[PDB]
Design a protein around this ligand. Structure first.
Ligand SMILES: O=CN(O)CCCP(=O)(O)O
Ligand SMILES: O=CN(O)CCCP(=O)(O)O
Ligand SMILES: [Mn+2]
Ligand SMILES: [Mn+2]
Lengths: 397, 397
């Protein structure tokens, strides 16, 4: 009977984790729900699971949730602010923490759940893209169990050997028989578009396109593969890998979520439906399993499976993210940062598609950075990179 | 520093296991070599690895091997017959036993390795296709460690959870989160041949055809899928699965060696080159890994991957085998028996290709069998099945 705390219990991955707790009530219990402003879905969930706690980002919002919970009689106690969240993450009697609150918002609560040595359902990129050095040391220190929920990492983890699974981060790949890790990705919708044509690409040609893909910003990240590359950054930290023990493969159909290469030639892989309840269920049930309400992969009703290597000319955002890792957590925190600006510039139509790569590039250049050292060094490197970025979209007016 | 005994040190899988020991001398050592008649390759091997024992099938052979070893000064001691082999399999100081001696020749030494409770690199179909009830009960009794080397079971084993790997045969699938096991297979060379055309198939059309396939008799078992079907029989026994927890899938390219379905939708799979040194190295190094000298799978230089369900009208030898499992070890020992006859009749041109399916069927019918009870009951059911078969090829003269 595991007990959890969800950080971002109102977003996509939050509800999926709640749909997972719902169909498996015999093993899971909510002790705390943490959200941002959706007081609306939060009451519903507090009403359904009845966490001992509910936390919202501001008092304005809590004083209202506190109110609708009042209406229903929900004994659920309401708190507010960031501290409240970190306190739910470090909660004494809590077993796992679905670190699904994204952005910089989540760096501290994910960290507080880490510091407390808890099984961590790591459901946010930024935690390792910006605070990777810190976060992994915080794990060594307290022996917190990282369990990645991201489709790719979930698959790479499931495909790894056991003694590397219990020591996530300090488990040496190569000594335990791993030749390399196979990070796979669709390759974006402009994978076969002639190179001189990526410049004339519109936002409508890249935005939530089929077979495991549906999100405004990440479509441009799937399209530029700034997404894969950023998962290269987390992979490297998460699994303790060196650029030689890494591989990025274009797998258009996204059936194979990602693989792991071994010494004797065996390649271990994971596949299933794109549904996030699969990796949310795996991580929660581990080292056992539970149902999630997801479809058994019909290998018949399926597309043919192909692969390819990325063309670093067609996907510059990936070579950037690879070199960015080689420069330090300041270069990747600022690369993640400037990228959100630029992608955004592209979606509003301020710069060409091919300008996201070139500009994220520039900010990374025009900025002599120095490795961070806490959840604040990282915040700052982000606000300086955003600024070199917001200011860069500008010269193109 | 593991020490082994190889049963059938001269055949294909033997040499591959000898090539695995060669490139990893730091972890493996031969204590005994067991062959059949090839005194010729046996000397060379005895000369190279210097096992404390070499065993041949007859004194005639051994008095000659004993002689050429004399020539070179090989201290290796030479023995003969079956007892010798069983003794090499039960050897006190031996850790693993590559049970690669195939046929009925190997049921007892494989058994002797089992009884003595040793890590068993299982490399012969018959062991479970005929003596499945007995072999698994002998495993329970002495807690021997089966480690399948067959491309498919190796893939299905690698893909299972840990607590099912260490208790091979008794670890319940479903209770450990396994939904079913995906037994995959090319589909044979007549997978797309119109149905009324299988009857006019010749032996040159089905014999050692590319992409993980090279053998006179199994090519016909690939073509009829009597091979897949027979692997459905070992699987059921090996992994402790019910016909519901089993799935047979056609995968033409044979990249994916086989998979394992889980409750949360996750499908774990193994892929790699068709080389046998991969599963031979995995089983030998287990729970660790060693190199084997095989090629890192180039996902680039690869065909598109497709899947399909077998058409039980196209592959009758598969339904036969599935229904055969449901009748007892007498129906499967006799099905494996009659199949070697018929296939063989087909290879010699005594019956049509489509006749293998119908005759194996018949023998199974025309023969009210009764479940075996030792390595003798199985031999017998084999001899009476061959006869109902040799005699059946006959009515078509
Ligand atoms: O968790 C899901 N993804 O990472 C999918 C994003 C699309 P991509 O694999 O082409 O980057
Ligand atoms: O170990 C190897 N095999 O099983 C391959 C035999 C050919 P098939 O997969 O089509 O039965
Ligand atoms: Mn992902
Ligand atoms: Mn096989």
């Amino acid at each position: 009977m595991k007990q959890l705390t969800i950080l971002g219990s109102t977003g996509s991955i939050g509800c999926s984790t709640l749909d997972v707790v719902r169909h498996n009530p015999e093993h899971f219990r909510v002790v705390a729900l943490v959200a941002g402003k959706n007081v609306t879905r939060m009451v519903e969930q507090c009403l359904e699971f009845s966490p001992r706690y509910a936390v919202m980002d501001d008092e304005a919002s809590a004083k209202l949730l506190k109110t609708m919970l009042q209406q229903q009689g929900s004994r659920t106690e309401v708190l507010s602010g960031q501290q409240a969240a970190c306190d739910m993450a470090a909660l004494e009697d809590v077993d796992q923490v679905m670190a699904a609150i994204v952005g910089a918002a989540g760096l501290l609560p994910t960290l507080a759940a880490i510091r407390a040595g808890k099984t961590i359902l790591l459901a946010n990129k930024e935690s390792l893209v910006t605070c990777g050095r810190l976060f992994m040391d915080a794990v060594k220190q307290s022996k917190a169990q990282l369990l990645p929920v991201d489709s790719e990492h979930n698959a790479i983890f499931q495909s790894l050997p056991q003694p590397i699974q219990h020591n996530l981060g300090y488990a040496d790949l190569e000594q335990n028989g791993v030749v390399s890790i196979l990070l796979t990705g669709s390759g974006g919708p402009f994978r076969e578009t002639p190179l001189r044509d990526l410049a004339t690409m519109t936002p409508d040609q890249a935005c939530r396109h089929p077979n495991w893909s549906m999100g405004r910003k990440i479509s441009v990240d799937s399209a530029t593969m700034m997404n894969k590359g950023l998962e290269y950054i987390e992979a490297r930290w998460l699994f303790n890998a060196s650029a030689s023990q890494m591989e990025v493969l274009i797998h258009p159909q996204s059936v194979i979520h990602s693989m792991v290469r071994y010494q004797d030639g065996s390649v271990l892989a994971q596949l299933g439906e794109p549904d996030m309840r699969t990796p949310i269920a795996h991580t929660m049930a581990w080292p056992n399993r539970v149902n999630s309400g997801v479809k058994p992969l019909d290998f018949c009703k399926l597309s043919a499976l192909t692969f390819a290597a990325p063309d670093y000319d067609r996907y510059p955002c990936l070579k950037l993210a690879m070199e960015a890792f080689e420069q330090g957590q300041a270069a990747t925190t600022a690369l993640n940062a400037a990228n959100e600006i630029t992608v955004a510039a592209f979606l509003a139509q301020q710069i060409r598609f091919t300008d996201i790569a070139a500009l994220n590039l520039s900010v990374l250049e025009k900025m002599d950075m120095r490795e961070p050292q806490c959840v604040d060094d990282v915040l700052s490197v982000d606000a300086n990179a955003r600024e070199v970025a917001r200011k860069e979209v500008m010269r193109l007016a």
